[PDB]
Amino acid sequence: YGAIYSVSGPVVIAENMIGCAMYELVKVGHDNLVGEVIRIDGDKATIQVYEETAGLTVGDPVLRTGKPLSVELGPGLMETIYDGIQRPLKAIKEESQSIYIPRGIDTPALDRTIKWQFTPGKFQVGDHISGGDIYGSVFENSLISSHKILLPPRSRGTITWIAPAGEYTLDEKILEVEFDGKKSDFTLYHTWPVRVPRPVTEKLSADYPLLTGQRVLDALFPCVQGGTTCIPGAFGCGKTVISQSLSKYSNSDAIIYVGCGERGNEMAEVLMEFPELYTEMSGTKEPIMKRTTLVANTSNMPVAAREASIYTGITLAEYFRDQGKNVSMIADSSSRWAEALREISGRLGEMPADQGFPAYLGAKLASFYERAGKAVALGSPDRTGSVSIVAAVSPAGGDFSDPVTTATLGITQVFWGLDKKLAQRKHFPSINTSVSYSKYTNVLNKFYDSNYPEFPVLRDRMKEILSNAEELEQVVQLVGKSALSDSDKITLDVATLIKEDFLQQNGYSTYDAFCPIWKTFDMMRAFISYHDEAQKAVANGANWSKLADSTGDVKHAVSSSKFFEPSRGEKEVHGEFEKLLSTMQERFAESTD
Amino acid sequence: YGAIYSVSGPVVIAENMIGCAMYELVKVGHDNLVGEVIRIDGDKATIQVYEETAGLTVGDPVLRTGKPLSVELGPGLMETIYDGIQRPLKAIKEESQSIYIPRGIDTPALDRTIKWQFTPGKFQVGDHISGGDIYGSVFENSLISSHKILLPPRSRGTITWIAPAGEYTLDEKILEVEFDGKKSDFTLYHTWPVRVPRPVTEKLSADYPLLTGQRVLDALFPCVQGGTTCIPGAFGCGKTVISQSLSKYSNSDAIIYVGCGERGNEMAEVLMEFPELYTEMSGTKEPIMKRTTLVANTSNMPVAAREASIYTGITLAEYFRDQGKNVSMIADSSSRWAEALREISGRLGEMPADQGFPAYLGAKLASFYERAGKAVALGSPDRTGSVSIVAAVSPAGGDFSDPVTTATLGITQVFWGLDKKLAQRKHFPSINTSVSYSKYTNVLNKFYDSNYPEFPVLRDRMKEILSNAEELEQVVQLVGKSALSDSDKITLDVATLIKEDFLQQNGYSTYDAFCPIWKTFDMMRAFISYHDEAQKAVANGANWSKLADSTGDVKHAVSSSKFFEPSRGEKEVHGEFEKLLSTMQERFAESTD
Amino acid sequence: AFIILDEVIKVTNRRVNAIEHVIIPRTENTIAYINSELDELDREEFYRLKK
Amino acid sequence: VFPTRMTLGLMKTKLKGANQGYSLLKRKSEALTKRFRDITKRIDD
Amino acid sequence: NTVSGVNGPLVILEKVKFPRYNEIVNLTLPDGTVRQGQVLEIRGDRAIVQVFEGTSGIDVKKTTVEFTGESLRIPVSEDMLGRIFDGSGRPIDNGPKVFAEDYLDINGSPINPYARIYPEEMISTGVSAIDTMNSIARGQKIPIFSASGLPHNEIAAQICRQAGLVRPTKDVHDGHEENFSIVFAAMGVNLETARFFKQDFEENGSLERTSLFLNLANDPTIERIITPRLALTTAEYLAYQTERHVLTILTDMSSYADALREVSAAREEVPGRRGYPGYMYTDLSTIYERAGRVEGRNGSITQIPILTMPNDDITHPIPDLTGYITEGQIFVDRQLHNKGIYPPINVLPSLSRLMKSAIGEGMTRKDHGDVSNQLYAKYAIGKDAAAMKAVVGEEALSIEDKLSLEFLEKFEKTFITQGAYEDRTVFESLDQAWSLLRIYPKEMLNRISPKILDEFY
Amino acid sequence: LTTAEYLAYQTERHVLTILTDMSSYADALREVSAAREEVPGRRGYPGYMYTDLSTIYERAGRVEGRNGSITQIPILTMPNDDITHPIPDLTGYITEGQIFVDRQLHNKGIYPPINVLPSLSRLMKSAIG
Amino acid sequence: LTTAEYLAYQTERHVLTILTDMSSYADALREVSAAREEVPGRRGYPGYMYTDLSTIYERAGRVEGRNGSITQIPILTMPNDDITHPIPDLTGYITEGQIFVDRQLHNKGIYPPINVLPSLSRLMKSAIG
């Protein structure tokens, strides 16, 4: 196509461009290094080349791939480790006999020797078809058909060719659409631009009720799907531990893990551990890995691939959203994504802005979160899917005043703190009601209120007990315990319980590993029930010391609920709690008298 | 003519120019937009077109006026509201059917529909004449001539003919002056460029008070006619309030109010407000307004107007200053004028100075404050005049160390600080002795001593009460008031009263807003007598709490004093303040023993 | 000994509260104000050079 | 107003002075009130 | 001719010199897409354009132009009430087709017949926290200054649902005489935030009396700057023709400023301080001029823009420029939110320049202003005295000071705390203030005249 | 670093690589640019200072076959005792912990004077056996 | 300055030149170089601002004949108030010590308000006897 005129630093400039667009992916020289066209001046195009250009010359060919930087979303996406531009890491490990991909070596974005068994959907020859309609499916899980083959968006028409059931190659075709002559052939894989967001029927307020199987999110400030959540990190405060937990314990269809530009030691752990680990909702065949599609960039990987990373993962999630599945998007960390932008600008001589950080920053961080959300799925059946975004942020200048952490807290309606201290004490996660908020909370609890749980009333009363306690601790310090009443001492005890039961977890049992909505509900019901009677009884002529000696057996039982099965009363409504109400009432008669 | 080469933003480049100064006025297109030639690059002169643009064809004629940007100096500018590019706003309301100026329009700078009354001078036939001589006068006011018509500077000769007394038009010629053949015929109005300061015979040292009308300003650090003032903002300044005060109370003959690219509401408040309030010496023809001429601009109104505002206003001031009239020139706000230079420097592409604010800000600003001052009037007659420049400034950096504030602070003579905490409590305008100075105070205080006041002694005692209060206030906050003694306890208390009573001049009265030189003196005297008596009384054996309790009612009476009108007793020196002296003395005997 | 102990603890209690509330946040806010101006002098220069 | 060009270094040490004082003085306070309490019960008896 | 290059959102066109300034051109892409753009710069046989649609994907000789020959104007109509738009004036929820009865160009200066007589009537939302301390006149602009970790969205929502219930009550007092309409422009906000605003207008029954313009952040940065301006051109039309008080809510200002900044570091102009534009002031000024009474003198445009500090300071370039242009600010604080106070609007440095003007005596008391002066002083001193109480204990805390401590608590939990359906009136606010203020002696209450004080303690 | 990757892969040896001084390497990187159209970031140090650090960092980790390894300890000198200095901050984010050595202990006359007060190894448990 | 040098050299006089205001002199230098090829350094001040100051400062010192001298007193107002601002910082280096006037003394009500704590002249002892 083009010819190289000049190569200056990492940047290659190439002449004889009469048809390079400014988002196009090109392979530069004969070394086929990856590059993308930033700017065009005249017939000369400016390309930032992301992969080492030592060996590259001037007068060499520039061959376009014919499309922008894109990701291919095809079948065979589960039980694979990718890069952020998407090229199988795993296939390079076998073939090159080198773990990482070195300069000048490239592979197709997915394996292509693989063949899949395609079953038809609900279409037939000569019927009209539209975007998001299920044209067939492929299994990849023995739980779900992960890859529903949908008609491509930006494509509609009448279908001249429907292939039947049978096994086909990725290269091989199965569909032809007639839409102003032959529109093209289609294959199992479809292409999609990273920075362009998929079209959907409509997006709705995040309110869809599902757990992450971690109780403390739900209980303290309702966990949201279709949410946006920021979490502060510092790369040894136990953030990485909760991310692997958050991925396992969930009951969502898939989890997409994005290591934006991480240590690489943390990426190594997710590759290996997740197939060792077992589903909390049953399934074999490499359990966690089978539900997970893994994008892994370490911090040393091309600045383009790290930059693309967050976009590429969210694209896979949005597509699946359109399929009518609920996907969880877990990204660590947007501070590394931000940093990469700074690198590119600086290499071009594009002016950054505030705190040395790009001007491009605000609008980009915002563009990303809006892709995530609850939607009713694109296509004619109409289904509900959701994509929940959890992004870690961390200092980018050694301060929290960094543009990135402060910009994202503005966009998000959920903030959940994370502490070194609670992690050393073996509470994982580490969320406290002083370093958090969730404004999504009113809609969620409301949703919960319908199903059976008394959730809204219980939750407001929970926040208040932990708040009021903090204040009561400050008195213990200054004055001591000789200015506190039985009723204030009682507040402290209830608060200790709330903290113990919800916040502290570590995988003690396969009852901490997964918890349903019901067990969360029974725990708090028990704590409030004790609180009102106990305070009432000290008002009527009792003592905290008295309450303590008599309560004994029932009180230890509510503390230990977390080790025991919730399946005691029924099957997921806990019997250890249901009996407790009667005993606590009986307890109170004895206490007053 | 010119041909428009490029329109890039508000900066427009046109080829095929000739002449061209560097302040030459040009009209761009057939639309006739306001511009000025900034630079020349080659044959092509680069003009910033400061008027709005959404429909200017490239390749239209550009017409030179042949001359720099100027203002017309002559009769009927008084009691007239203009923008800085000199278009009668009042005329613009009638014609356009729009209050503000529409773009693509231009109209003459003085109404040419009216006739004015010429009365003879002091230069008859065959008297020699030289610029700034009073050729005659035109009455515009109902007690004074606001426009005494001068021969323009750098004109001289002997007068062949003076036309007799009568009414004429301002377009109409009434003079012939002979220098080197028929020099020209003259009209009532003459032009003068705003970028050329009008000459003066000699400058005189300032010595005659600017009566600011405000207690807090007279008392803490007084200003002088011929003065220079800087006021820093932060939007708790109360600039409109103090500007409105300056127009009414200041005893200057003329006041030129300049809107430098303001809110557009505030300029509207001061126009409407003047006819409702009354002059300080009787007269109605729209009272205050009859002595007030306005330059009014709004923020997204033509930038040429905004930029020209201080220059056009100060040239207006200089004209009246040569006539031998005392003038108070209020610039509000010059930091928006300086902002314009930031913008200019940006559009052109030239590199800036400190924090993006250009280096030419300091020198331009310094020329401006230097064209003001007290002087002996230009011409043979000899009169005395004044220009008092009062200029508000503001940060945009969230500190007081920013270029705009700093460059004014360098140059300014009188400084009236702004203390955000006091203003948060409301104390418009708010000052402490440590943030403010007047270098002029010494020479002013000797002048006030002649007048009646005990003024010198009161200036030293005022500084001293505030200065001691500041040091003690740190010790009270951190350590406790336990270390302090009862006399120093008093120091805080008397000083507090001065904060609330002086600084606060927003009021809901014109007695709580106008405090005459005499009213300001009595108040300060009464308050110091208290402090001295108070330190003694505790010294020979009395408490801060006990002392406070005995004065009690008498303390409330001094607080509420300010509300009471000044027109009673001898003049503003009331019997109300005189009796109060005796009651303090009596109280002193009680307090001690 | 008790009466004295009673007076001294009251003073030591005031000092902890004073350093915590006033002193430390003043050091934070002043540091920050100066930081923001400072980084901009370095950055704008590079833009001036590039232009 | 405080110096713009490299105040950072002095101002950091001001913070370290302040910080050291909170911990140490709180230890000192903690200990005096712990004693105070012991005396209280003795004096009362 | 055809496209020579694109550098960022600037497009380098080679074309002739005949178009006018802000003349629309159309780019024919080979992708089956048309994109519109408007000339930012015209030069010797080339132009530099910012495209409203897309930001990338612009070619060289595959891409061609045809110039429209028509400068950028908004078809402003008055039967635009109840219709739903996006950030360009296309329907996204199938609101009625734009039509046309007049065309006005956007320049921040349509016909500009803004104020030379100031506002003096009063508008109340029933919020004491707002109204008393900041007396909103019928064409003043007072923004909401908030910061991250606050529910600025929720307060903007309080105004919108409670406005249009309070106003007919105010109609009788002669605070109003005419109907109210709300023109809501959202910039750069989330789907979730956008729906919230729409939910509030439905919920009340003012969906037919509101215009809603929705711009999202994932729509071009160039689309985002046109969104407040488009809303404002429309707003002026409603004011002119049907004489209504139009309240404009322009949220969020920081989003708008981020857009300007990308088109100033990608410009051949060097930007101002902290990488924020050198004509950033100007860009903001364009909105702000469009305030006050409009000809026929019974319509007006009143402005409350919503700012969230993205860096938690008034040090930042956005608050400092914003506050200079407007006439006051209404401040929201973090502390109050954390505690459980809603609305969490603090009153410590919230200020109204045109307070005096706004209060009257033919629809408000004259004592509104006098009593305001006391509240601002007393609260301000009281907040500072409390922090001081913490440090000193009771050894530099007086009897009088104890009374200031009580006034502070009570003000916080009553004056500032009211639910999002609670409606007050001005007379009630004054009465409740009078009571709190009552414990203070006569001597203490010294910034208000004896005549007033004695009648109402 | 290249020499080391060959000894570690082909003949399987555990290699400890000692690299001093990363601050001088960083300076060189800031130093080159004097006719380039490439602009630096904060304190005059690149916006792409990350990228350069990363480059050294990419050769460090387990080799394929994994009985050999390449183990890296880079040595960074604070010139002015500032932990908010751009060099340590970027590095610190990438690295699996950090070792802090302070002036105070050298002054008492302890040698080596490693205060283990803010020092951390994040995979501390993972190493031992 | 040139006239002072003529006074000091030809007729062996003690010349005192009082040169006010350096700050105004500094700005003037700064406004230029806005169209020169020569480029401005730190805080937008020219880098050869030092060179400009040094030309002014050069005529100062004992003349040959050693019966005349020129003593020079430059007057600097800090426009920002700090002493680390470019205008004072560079001057203090070329000169041998400094004399500090201060705002704080002025506030109490002192004249001439002179703080002596950062004020030191490092060639003071040797000259005097």
Curated annotation (Swiss-Prot), chain D:
Protein purpose: Subunit of the V1 complex of vacuolar(H+)-ATPase (V-ATPase), a multisubunit enzyme composed of a peripheral complex (V1) that hydrolyzes ATP and a membrane integral complex (V0) that translocates protons. V-ATPase is responsible for acidifying and maintaining the pH of intracellular compartments.
Outline the subunit composition: V-ATPase is a heteromultimeric enzyme composed of a peripheral catalytic V1 complex (components A to H) attached to an integral membrane V0 proton pore complex (components: a, c, c', c'', d, e, f and VOA1). Interacts with RAV1 and RAV2 components of the RAVE complex, which are essential for the stability and assembly of V-ATPase.
What lineage does UniProt assign to this protein's organism?
Answer: Eukaryota, Fungi, Dikarya, Ascomycota, Saccharomycotina
Further notes on this entry? Present with 8500 molecules/cell in log phase SD medium.
Q: Where in the cell is it found?
A: Vacuole membrane
Part of the whole protein covered: 8 to 52 of 256
In terms of domain of life, where is this protein from? Answer: Eukaryota
Q: What is this protein called?
A: V-type proton ATPase subunit D
Regarding protein family, the annotation reads: Belongs to the V-ATPase D subunit family.
Q: Which residues form a coiled coil?
A: none
Swiss-Prot record, chain E:
- Pfam families in UniProt: ATP-synt_ab, ATP-synt_ab_N, ATP-synt_VA_C
This molecule's function is given as:
Non-catalytic subunit of the V1 complex of vacuolar(H+)-ATPase (V-ATPase), a multisubunit enzyme composed of a peripheral complex (V1) that hydrolyzes ATP and a membrane integral complex (V0) that translocates protons. V-ATPase is responsible for acidifying and maintaining the pH of intracellular compartments.
GO terms of biological process kind: ATP metabolic process; endosomal lumen acidification; Golgi lumen acidification; intracellular calcium ion homeostasis; pexophagy; proteasome storage granule assembly; proton transmembrane transport; transmembrane transport
> Which organism does this record belong to?
Saccharomyces cerevisiae (strain ATCC 204508 / S288c) (Baker's yeast)
Q: How does it assemble?
A: V-ATPase is a heteromultimeric enzyme composed of a peripheral catalytic V1 complex (components A to H) attached to an integral membrane V0 proton pore complex (components: a, c, c', c'', d, e, f and VOA1). Interacts with RAV1 and RAV2 components of the RAVE complex, which are essential for the stability and assembly of V-ATPase.
- Which keywords does this chain's UniProt record carry? ATP-binding, Hydrogen ion transport, Ion transport, Isopeptide bond, Membrane, Nucleotide-binding, Phosphoprotein, Transport, Ubl conjugation, Vacuole
Q: Which gene does this sequence derive from?
A: VMA2
- PTM annotation (Phosphoserine): residues: 109
The protein's GO terms of the molecular function aspect are: ATP binding; proton-transporting ATPase activity, rotational mechanism
Residues holding ATP: 353
What does UniProt give as GO cellular component? cytoplasm; cytoplasmic stress granule; fungal-type vacuole membrane; Golgi membrane; membrane raft; proton-transporting V-type ATPase complex; vacuolar proton-transporting V-type ATPase complex; vacuolar proton-transporting V-type ATPase, V1 domain
Q: What is this protein's record name?
A: V-type proton ATPase subunit B
Q: How does this protein sit in the membrane?
A: Peripheral membrane protein
Curated annotation (Swiss-Prot), chains F, G:
Q: Which domain of life is it from?
A: Eukaryota
Q: Localized where?
A: Vacuole membrane
Binding residue positions for ATP: 122
Q: How does it assemble?
A: V-ATPase is a heteromultimeric enzyme composed of a peripheral catalytic V1 complex (components A to H) attached to an integral membrane V0 proton pore complex (components: a, c, c', c'', d, e, f and VOA1). Interacts with RAV1 and RAV2 components of the RAVE complex, which are essential for the stability and assembly of V-ATPase.
Q: What else is known?
A: Present with 131000 molecules/cell in log phase SD medium.
Which family does the record claim for this protein? Belongs to the ATPase alpha/beta chains family.
- Please describe what this protein does: Non-catalytic subunit of the V1 complex of vacuolar(H+)-ATPase (V-ATPase), a multisubunit enzyme composed of a peripheral complex (V1) that hydrolyzes ATP and a membrane integral complex (V0) that translocates protons. V-ATPase is responsible for acidifying and maintaining the pH of intracellular compartments.
User: What is the name listed in the Swiss-Prot or TrEMBL entry for this protein?
Assistant: V-type proton ATPase subunit B
Organism listed in the record: Saccharomyces cerevisiae (strain ATCC 204508 / S288c) (Baker's yeast)
Parent-record interval covered = 260 to 388 of 517
